Structure formats: structure tokens, C-alpha cells
Amino acid sequence: MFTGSIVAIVTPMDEKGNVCRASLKKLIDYHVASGTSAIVSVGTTGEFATLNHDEHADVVMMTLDLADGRIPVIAGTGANATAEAISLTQRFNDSGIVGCLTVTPYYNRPSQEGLYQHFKAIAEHTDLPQILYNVPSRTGCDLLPETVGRLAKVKNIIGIKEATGNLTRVNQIKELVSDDFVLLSGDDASALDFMQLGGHGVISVTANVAARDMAQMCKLAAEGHFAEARVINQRLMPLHNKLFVEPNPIPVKWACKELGLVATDTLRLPMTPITDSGRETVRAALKHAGLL
Amino acid sequence: MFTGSIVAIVTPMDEKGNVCRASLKKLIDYHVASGTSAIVSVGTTGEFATLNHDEHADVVMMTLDLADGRIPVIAGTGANATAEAISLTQRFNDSGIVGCLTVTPYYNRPSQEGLYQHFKAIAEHTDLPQILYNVPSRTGCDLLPETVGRLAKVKNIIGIKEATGNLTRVNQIKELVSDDFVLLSGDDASALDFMQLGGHGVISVTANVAARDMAQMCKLAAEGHFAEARVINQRLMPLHNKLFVEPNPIPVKWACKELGLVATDTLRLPMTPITDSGRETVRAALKHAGLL
Amino acid sequence: MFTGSIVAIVTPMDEKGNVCRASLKKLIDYHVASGTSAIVSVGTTGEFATLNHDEHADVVMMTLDLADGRIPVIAGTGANATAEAISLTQRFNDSGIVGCLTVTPYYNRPSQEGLYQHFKAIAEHTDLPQILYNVPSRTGCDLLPETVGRLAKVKNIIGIKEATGNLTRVNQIKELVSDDFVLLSGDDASALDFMQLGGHGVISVTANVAARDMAQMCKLAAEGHFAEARVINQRLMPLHNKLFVEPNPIPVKWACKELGLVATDTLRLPMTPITDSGRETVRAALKHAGLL
Amino acid sequence: MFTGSIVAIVTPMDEKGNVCRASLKKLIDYHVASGTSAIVSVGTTGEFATLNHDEHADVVMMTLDLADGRIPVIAGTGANATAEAISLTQRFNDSGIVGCLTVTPYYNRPSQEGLYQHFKAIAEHTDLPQILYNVPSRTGCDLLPETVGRLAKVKNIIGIKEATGNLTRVNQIKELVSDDFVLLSGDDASALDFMQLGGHGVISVTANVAARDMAQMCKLAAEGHFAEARVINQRLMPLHNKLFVEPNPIPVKWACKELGLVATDTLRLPMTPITDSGRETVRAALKHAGLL
Ligand SMILES: N[C@@H](CCCC[NH3+])C(=O)O
Ligand SMILES: N[C@@H](CCCC[NH3+])C(=O)O
Ligand SMILES: N[C@@H](CCCC[NH3+])C(=O)O
Ligand SMILES: N[C@@H](CCCC[NH3+])C(=O)O
Ligand SMILES: [K+]
Ligand SMILES: [K+]
Ligand SMILES: [K+]
Ligand SMILES: [K+]
């Protein structure tokens, strides 16, 4: 459902830039085998920006089909226009997905009242659970704790993916919401720290290529075994950093390809192929994690 | 026309959020009479995020129809997916627009090489002049002078709307491009400074309500009469700042309503109505400018 | 020694701006009674910048005398010139102080190698334990974890006061140093979070006026009772923030005066008296903490 | 003289870190012959942080003695304690200096009112012209245009060395002060831009090694010949940047040694010797400038 190691799964492509079913199946089977808790389909790492709404929906539905009830699937459903986010969410109503990951509007920099109205309107047009997603480095907007508090009062707003990397937010939000509101890290390099402070899991980029380690790290964290979890964290720390050596998901797609998890590392413009230097950096990080 | 005072025009809406032809007509007449150089249609200030492609195109064509050859129209054509930007541009080829204003991809944070490929691909598939648009505070990425220099070698790429407010960019770019490449400010509060450093004009929010003063300011600047231009700028400075007291174009639409230029100040979610405190601040700024 | 609630004690003054012995005695007795773990004398909150070296030394020695072995005393000994920091430290050698709090050089923005050489040289000219102090908002310099690691190899460099407010630093530093290196927060508003992550205590501004609450919060933290500690934290959160409503130690001196702990709230220029609005804000924070 | 190219001169040292009279003489002769407007003695670049008051005064008096009336000398007189700044200023009254350069207090982060009181008190107790110095990246505080406007009403406060690199400050300050208040850049890389916007000169690091080119650049700027000035600036731009590749004045002292202007590149801790990579970068910048 909404705890533990949740993968922000890549949308693997063929050389033409369209979804590769065989690759997607291999990834999903990998996550089932590895103990991943849930899959976020067509979030940021899944190239939401460069799929059209139909393509996006096809990937989500394919991912649900391939998961075949073995692993819960959360759909990316954000938009910077409220009407468009409502449309997208409505596509998944009564679909099998367990909830939605919905990003603060990007580019148009709404106020906190705007963010409140946007997410409230979206929640009102679905029965699905909603996970808010805050990532100001990408959006130009910052969904502050006070506003998360106001939104957490809406019945089906049930958690947040907090991708600021600002660890003070964990307890700021926790004090304004009920004990069942879920706090998930959106920042792999700080996620263990984030769980140590009270968070419930991570929506992870690193879990694409280190799924078993991430699941084990998160289990240990949930049980309060921080020192054991840190050892795993330290082995993964170069990936947590170097998967952003070039823009996400350029490095993680290459890593998936190098590990034999996907057929090609193709992306859509304006994402471009990994540089030679980037390959060498990511390769070293994979070697450090024991994956290669 | 790509120099002087260029208005980033509001998209006036009725109470249902649909484009108000009558209000738009009144704005376009105002710009023609007030000496505005050109109209940017469905830019940021025109709520490009919350119009769908069809609506966006309708507004541009309506603007061209109402302008009736009396003022040049530049279309907002940016996207964060290169295929989508190409597609949107094709809809305007042979429309009568004089050029396009194309923003760096937002949210996905491409590399400089990605930006280069993005804009090169867009330019390749049109004969329309392209004006690059850099606004890191909205997009999460920053198109740097080195990359602007690379792109300025593309025949069709003719200028940049530089909205960082970082005035060192003027001469960093100027020294890498030819004399005929246009440097336009996208930051009203620093625009006169930008012109004094060698910029050619401004793509302006303030121009929506102070069109004549903007046009005269930019002419005086182009002639080197900076002290005279500065007097105008000082009367407009509160508006340059307070049109962003709440997210653009919330204040400017309320200002246009208050002057009588549009029938309603309605916006689309996630933009929300101006607060009372914002009305007060904006009205005071209009009065400082001598407009009310 | 170097754990729990450590007060960054004010240097109380008379109306002429010189140390008030009676006030200092009242504070010290308060900290003994309250369970404060140690006193940092003439740190930042003690107005190190505006005492001359003789005055600084007189305050430290007076504080040691008044403490009368009841509470350990750590001297502020930082300087932005290495020779000057060595001179100051040498004043306290064989004095009774238990260690030194030594800030990264300010203003001159040395490199990390510079910071390494500065602190190594200082440590070499004393047998006293050294606590490094990182506060980039004040110094223009940031002592990174890697360099803290290099310094922690020097026998008498034994801990750090980490005043970035960046909670990721706790585990970054912890992984590079031995298990006996002390990690203390320098940021009251994040300090409980900092202890939750592995830190050992706080050098606190808030402890000047909430000494018993701070000591109890830190004891609960050390014992792993985070939820009980948070309740205390929440009552103190407005002070942790509002003691910086005007520049430290302007608010905390006023609060000390209002509580009857010191005779006057006088400071030395360029610190200036608290504003009326500041008094009202700090008063409300004191009322929230139950102290007034 | 408070206009044109003003050098922030190095304090040349022998291998023991004491001032080298012979090297200083050679620098002063160089500045006299190269048309530098004035010499700032024991500013930032002159290692004011690591000289004691007596040494600082000795260097200023030695500079005046060697200058022998042939070039004006401005003393660095700032401090972070207002009494200390007053005291240091008194040592120079009737010395033959033409003015003082006085930095905003560093480390203690005073309010704007504190800055106002600080500088007003210093100005009150001298008849020497005072030049305010704003450099937030070093001090932790930012003297804002509104406060500069307040201080410019003090008879003795005659200008500002604005080292933010934020070029919007030029005209924000200019509009609040009289026509005779001097605006000087303290950021070599943006200095020509600063002059083009209405600044009167530059207090320069680059001028230590490119005195003639700096002097001609600033004259051309003062005459309005910006394109001609820009040609010079483009040859100096790598030096403007690479003199800060390691902390100032590490690079510039090594550059002066490499040109033969000083006998040693020695600095005081916490400044440390230039790295090999830094030598390479700086030498390349000197060659681009045509100096080697
Ligand atoms: N590329 C546009 C539309 C994406 C459609 C959602 N899959 C944006 O990021 O909003
Ligand atoms: N709302 C989406 C699609 C808008 C279509 C362009 N008018 C975005 O900002 O990319
Ligand atoms: N005010 C100067 C000297 C202070 C002397 C130390 N108590 C500085 O902050 O370095
Ligand atoms: N090193 C101390 C005192 C220097 C005295 C002035 N030359 C500071 O930067 O304030
Ligand atoms: K809820
Ligand atoms: K071109
Ligand atoms: K040690
Ligand atoms: K004056």
C-alpha cells in the first residue's frame, strides 16, 4: 500500500521511444521478487512530462496488468492545471490502482491557497487515496507543512512524498496531521534519515536497480534497526547521489540497461543519452553497491 | 517586431473561465493606440499552463483576427516535451504570427545539451523566428549564456527573453551572439537596467496596464536617454513589483478589471482570486503610476 | 562535560555595556538549579564579537569563579586569524575550563585546507578539548563533513557544534568520526530532530530562559523518549524561532530581563535595543512556553 | 580620489608573514606609473583579518610614506564592533589618508537599524570621508539601499563599495542619494556592467596585476565608451573570475609574485599556499590578459 520501499519505476522504452512491454514485465517481476512494497507508475522517474495523457494511461494500465495483483500500483496523476489533473485522475477511477501520486502544480507557481484548492478539487473527484508530492526544485512551488495540515483534513488525502531533502519537514508535518497520514521521502540520499525521524518509507529512484537492498533497508528502519539499515545505506550512497549525475531518469535507465533489466536506455527529448563520463560514474556506483 | 515594449498579454476570461472576445478586443485596441510594439499571446501571463492546445490556439488566432494587421503577434509555443512543442508550433505555421516565444522545459530539468537539442529541433521544423525564454524560478532549469550562444547560430533562433533578473546575463550573452540577436528582459522590475546594459526591449507584464508609459520608456532607452527613461520607471516601479504580490497573472488581471479594460478578473485553477490585501497593494501601485 | 542541554550564555551587562557580576551570578545559579549540563562562556550569544580579548577573558574567568565547580564551563575561543585564536586559547590553558568552542574563521572565507590547518594549529597549542563550530550564515564559510573527519583525527578535537540547521549533516559526520566524537546542535529549532538522528545535545540559545525544559527535553531524547521530548519541544518552538526575531542576542537578553534573571538588557553596538514589536513577539513566545 | 580604478592592494609579506617594505614600494610605484586612481590599504585583499591593529596601522602609514603624495591612500577601517571601528579610525585622523573604507559588521548580523547606528557613530567621530562596504557573502549581512539612503545624509558618508554583484543595486541606491555620492563596484567580474549602469569606478582586485588596463577601462566607461571598455574587460574576464579560484588574496598574491612585483606570495593562516591546479588556472588567466 503506502509504507516501505516504493519504486518510482522507469518507463522502459524501445529505440523509438515507446513503452517496451517485455522490459516492463521484467522490471515488475524483479520488484515482486525483491520485496518492493509498491510501484509508482509514470511519476517523475517514469517520464510523465514527455508522455501524452493517453500514453501515460496506457503505461499505468499495462503496469497494473503485468503486476497481476502481486504488487500494488500507484498512478502518477499530477498536472499544473486543476482541470487536467481531475481528467487524468478520472481515467484511473475503478481501475485497480490503489492510489495516486499528485505533484504540486509546476511552472505557474500558485499560492498556498491555490495549492489547497487544486488538491481539494482533485480529491473531491475521486474515491482513490491521494499522496501529495512536493518537489520545489522542479516545480518552483513549495507546499508548506501548514498547508499539508489543511489538506490532510480531506478524507482521501492520505500522505505526502516530501522531496525537498529538508529533513525538518518530517516533524513539522507530523505534528499537524493524524497518526495515520503517511510521510514518504522523495529524496533517496536523505531517505534513511527521513525514516529515522518518523517517516514511513521512500518513493525511490535507487529502488529501480537496488530493489532488494532498499526493501531490506526500509524493513530495518521500520523496526528501529537504524545502525543495520545504515550499513546498507552506505553501500547505496554513491547510487543515491550518482543517479542524479545527469538529469533523472537518464542515469537510472542506463543502470537498468547495464544490469540487464531493460532492453534499451532510450528516453524522450529533452532528456538525452547518458554521457561517457556519466556512464563511468554510474558504473562505479553500481560496483560500490555490489550490483556489478 | 522584436524590440521595444512587447506586452505579455492577459487571456481575459468570463466567469466560467472561457476567453472573452470582447475584453480581448478592447486590450488589443488599447495596445494599438498606446504604441506597444507587439503582443505575446498565451505566454505565462496569458495562462498557457491552464489552456489546452486547442484553446491556446484559439486564443492566438482570435488575437491575430482582432489585431487585424495593426500590431504584430508572437505566440507562446513552449512545452516541456520536445514533440509537444514541435506539434504546437506546427499549428501556427502560416497563421500570420510573426514569431514564437518558447520556454525552456519545466519540471524535467534537462541538461544544457538537452536544451540545445530541444530548441534546435523546434527551430528546424518551422520557418518562424524563435525567441528562447529563460525563467529558472518557474522551470527549475537555467539556460546558460554558453548554450544561448550555440543556439543563436541556428538561423531561426533570433533572440531571448531573459527572465532571471540577473543583469550580468546581458553582456555574457551579447558577447557570444551576433549583433542582430535580440535580448529582451522578462523581468519588469530590472528591465530598464537590462536595456541600459544593451538589451533591446522587454516582454512585459506591466505593459498590460501602462502601455504608453512602457512604450515611451523603452523608446527613450533605445535612444540612450536613460535618465529620462528612469523617471518613468520610478513611477512604474511599485507596479513592476506589486504585479507579483500574488502569483502572476492574478494581480494584473485584477488591475485590468479595475481600469475597465476587461469585463472580469477570472482565472483558472490553480490560480485563485486576488486577496483583499492584494487589491489594496495593487491599487496603490496603480495610483503611484497615475493610472487611477 | 559535552552532552545534554548546554547553554550559550548571555554576557549580561549594566547600562554602560560592561559585565554585570550580580546578573551573571544569578544566571549561573539558575543553570545549576535547572540541570543545565554546561555553560559556553562568550560564544556568539555572549557577544564575543564586541568584547575585546581582555574583556572576553575576564568574563570567562568570572563565569568559572561563579560556577565554583558546580557546572562545567567551556570558553568561546574562536578567531578568524589563526595566531589570534591560538593567543586566546592560551589564555585559558590550566584555567579550570573544560574545553573550548572555536568557530570557523569568519569573513576571510578560507578553503577547507585552510580550515584544516587553522583548527589543527589551534589544537596543537593546547591540551584542552576543542569543539569545532560551523555556522555558515554568520561566517561565509562551511566546514564540510569530510574536513570534520580529517580534524576528528587530531587527539583533542572532540566534537562539533553544527549550526547549519541542515540535518543531513548529523549522519554524514557520524560516519566519518569515531563513536566518542560529540555532535551538538547549534540550531534550537532543529535540535530535537538533530538528537533524534544521533546527536548528543545542543548548545542552546533557548536554554538561557527555559533551562529546566531544555534539560528535561535533552534527557528524554538521550533515553529515546522522543514523543515525550516533542511535547516539550512544541511548547518551546515559538521561543526557538522568536529568539531570532531580531538579531541574537537582542531577544534573549530582553527575555532574560523580563524574567528577572538579569538587571538590564543592554548590548553593545552594532546590536541595538529590541523593538516594541519584537518585545510583543518574544513576550507571546514566553507565555506559550509557560514562563510568564 | 574616489572614482576610476582603485586598487584593493595586497599586503606583501616575507616568508615569516611580516610586511615587505621593498615589495610594497614596487607595487606603489607600479600603481603611480599605471594610472591607478587610489590605493585601498589593508582592505579585504590586504588581509585585514589577520593583521593586528598595530600592524594594520603600520601598513597604512608605510603605504602613505612610500606613496609620498603621488597617489591617494584610503585606509581599510572596518570592524564588527562599533567601538573598535571608532578606535581604528582615530589612529588615522591627520595621517594623510584621504578616506576610509568601512565594512558592514561581519559575523554578528546586525539589523538595518544597527548598521545605521554603527556607521553614523563612526562618521561622527572623524572628519575623514567614509566609503561604506557591503559584501554579504563574507559578512552575513546585507546593507540594503534604503539604509544606504539614510546614511548618505550623513555629511562624511560619501559612497559605497557595493560587492554583492547584484547589479540592480546601482540604480536602487542612486535614486535614494545625491548626485555626488559615489557608487563603486567591489566585484571585478561585474564592475564594467556596474559602471555602465551609473557606477563611478571600482575597488579592484584585478587592478593589482592589470593596473593600466583597469585604469583605461574605467576611463572609457566614465566617458560612455562602453563598447571600447568591453574589449578590455573581455581580455580581463578570466582574471576577474580566476583571482577567486582559491580564496582572495591567495591567487592575486601568487600572480604578483609571478610577474615580479612582490618577493614572496606568503599569506597568514587561515589563508594557505596556492594549489598547483590554481597556479595553472591563474597563469592561463594572466596570459589571456597579455600580462605574461
Ligand atoms: N508535457 C506536459 C503534459 C504531460 C501530460 C501528462 N502525462 C506536462 O508536463 O504537463
Ligand atoms: N498544462 C500543461 C499543458 C498545457 C498545454 C499548452 N497550452 C503544461 O503546462 O505543459
Ligand atoms: N571584534 C573582533 C575581535 C573580537 C575579539 C574576541 N573576543 C572579531 O570578532 O574578531
Ligand atoms: N582578526 C579580527 C581583528 C582584526 C583587526 C583589524 N586589522 C577581525 O577580523 O575583526
Ligand atoms: K485524510
Ligand atoms: K540566429
Ligand atoms: K579526536
Ligand atoms: K553624504
Q: Å from B109 to nearest chain A CA? A: 6
Q: Which of B168, B171, B190 sits opposite D230 (nearest CB)?
A: B171
Sole residue written with cell 592561463: D284
Rg (CA), chain B: 18
**What is the CA(B190)–ligand 2 centre distance, in A?**
28
Give the Å distance between the CA of D22 and the centre of ligand 4.
25
HEC per residue, A20-39: CHHHHHHHHHHHHHHCCCEE
- Cβ D183 vs Cβ D159: under 8 Å: yes
The DSSP symbol for D13 reads B
Residues C44 and C9: beta-carbon distance below 8 Å: no
Ligand having the closest approach to the CA of B102:
2
Please give the Cα distance from B29 to A281 (Å, whole number).
Answer: 58
With beta carbons under 8 A apart, name residues in chain A contacting B271: 108, 110, 114
Strands C182-185 and C130-134: unpaired
Nearest ligand 3 atom to alpha carbon C49: 9
| Ligand nearest the Cα atom of residue A46 | 1
| Cα distance between residue B31 and residue D146, in whole Å | 35
Resolution (angstroms) equals 1.8
A53 Cβ below 6 A of ligand 1: yes
Q: Are C206 and C214 in contact (CB under 8 A)?
A: yes
Question: What residue type is assigned to position D148 of the chain?
Answer: V
Domain D4-289: CATH architecture, name and number where available: Alpha-Beta Barrel (3.20)
Per the CB < 8 A criterion, the answer to whether B47 and B249 are in contact is: yes
Instruction: Please report, for residues A19, A143, A224, B246, B273, the alpha-carbon distance to residue A112 in angstroms, rounded to integers and kept in the order given.
Output: 36, 7, 35, 10, 12
Measured distance CA(C291)–CA(C34) in Å, rounded: 14
Q: Other CB atoms closer than 10 Å to residue C13's CB: what's the count? A: 21
User: Could you tell me which of C284, C292, C289 has the C-alpha nearest to residue C258?
Assistant: C292
What three-state secondary structure class fits B38? strand
Name which of B159, B153, B17, B52 is nearest B101 in CA terms.
B159
Q: Residue A245 and residue A255: Cα distance in Å, rounded?
A: 12
Mutate to test the pocket of ligand 1, among A11, A40, A47, A48 (most ligand atoms within 8 A of CB): A48
User: Dmax over Cα atoms in chain C, in whole Å?
Assistant: 49
Q: Show the 3-state SS of chain C.
A: CCCEEEEECCCCECCCCCECHHHHHHHHHHHHHHCCCEEEECCCCCCHHHCCHHHHHHHHHHHHHHHCCCCCEEEECCCCCHHHHHHHHHHHCCCCCCEEEEECCCCCCCCHHHHHHHHHHHHHCCCCCEEEEECHHHHCCCCCHHHHHHHCCCCCEEEEEECCCCCCHHHHHHCCCCCCCEEEECCHHHHHHHHHCCCCEEEECHHHCCHHHHHHHHHHHHCCCHHHHHHHHHHHHHHHHHCCCCCCCHHHHHHHHHCCCCCCCCCCCCCCCCCHHHHHHHHHHHHHCCCC
In the numeric block, which cell numbers belong to residue A105?
502544480
Write out the residues of chain D at the interface with chain C, using a CB-CB cutoff of 8 A: 44, 47, 49-50, 52, 80-84, 105-111, 113-115, 117-118, 121, 137-140, 246-247, 268-272
Chain C: give the shortest CA distance to residue A190, in Å.
7
Interatomic CA distance for residues C125 and D49, integer angstroms? 21
The answer to whether B49 contacts A105, with C-beta atoms less than 8 Å apart, is yes
Residue nearest to atom 1 of ligand 3 (CA): C49
Chain centroid to Cα B260, Å, comes to 22
- Among this protein's residues, is B161 annotated catalytic? yes
Tell me, using a 6 A CB cutoff, whether residue A81 lines ligand 2.
yes
Closest listed residue to residue A98, CA positions, set A79, A76, A74, A116: A74
Q: Where are the alpha helices (DSSP H) in D176-225?
A: 191-196, 211-222
Which residues of chain B approach chain D closer than 8 Å at the C-beta? 165, 167-168, 170-171, 175, 189-190, 192-193, 196-197, 230, 234
Which residues of A are known binding-site members for pyruvate? 45, 203
In short, whether B53's Cβ falls inside 6 Å of ligand 2 is yes
In chain D, which residues have their Cβ closer than 8 Å to the Cβ of C125? none
**CB contacts, 8 Å: A170 with chain C:** 193
Cell of B155: 538561423
What separation in Å is there between the alpha carbon of B52 and the centre of ligand 2? 6
User: Which chains contact B through at least 3 pairs of Cβ atoms less than 8 Å apart?
Assistant: A, D
Active centre residues of A (catalytic)? 133, 161
Instruction: Please report, for chain C, the start and end positions of each structural domain, with discontinuous segments joined by +.
Output: 4-289
Chain D residues within 8 A of C103 when measuring between CB atoms = 107
Side chain identity, residue B48: F
Cβ neighbours for A67, distance < 8 A, ≥ 6 positions apart: A28, A32, A39, A73
Query: CA nearest C237 in A: which residue?
Result: A172
With CB atoms and an 8 Å threshold, state whether A196 touches C196: yes
Residue B186 to residues B50, B135, B192, C129, D51, Cα–Cα distance (Å): 20, 8, 11, 55, 46
Overall residue count recorded for chain C in this entry: 292
Residue A3 exposed, middle or buried by CB count within 10 Å (0-12, 13-18, 19+): middle
A270: chain B residues, CB-CB within 8 Å: 80-82, 105, 108, 110, 114-115, 117-118
Contact B193, B245 (CB under 8 A): no
Q: C276-288 and C226-242 helices cross at what angle (nearest 10)?
A: 170
Q: Are C113 and D272 an interchain contact pair (Cβ–Cβ within 8 Å)? A: yes
Q: Could you say which ligand is closest to the alpha carbon of residue D60? A: 4
- d(CA D133, CA D99) in angstroms, rounded, equals 13
Interface of C with D (CB under 8 A): 44, 49-50, 52, 80-84, 103, 105-111, 113-115, 117-118, 121, 137-140, 246-248, 250, 268-272
Instruction: Give yes or no for residue C53 CB within 6 A of ligand 3.
Output: yes
What separation in Å is there between the alpha carbon of B144 and the centre of ligand 2? 24
**φ, ψ for residue A12 (rounded to 5)?**
-70, 145
Separation CA C231–CA D206 (nearest Å)? 56
3-state secondary structure at position B238 = helix
CA distance B52 to chain A (A): 9
Residue B133 annotated as catalytic: yes
**Which residue, among C167, C230, C232, would best test binding to A if mutated, counting the most A CBs under 10 Å from its CB?**
C167
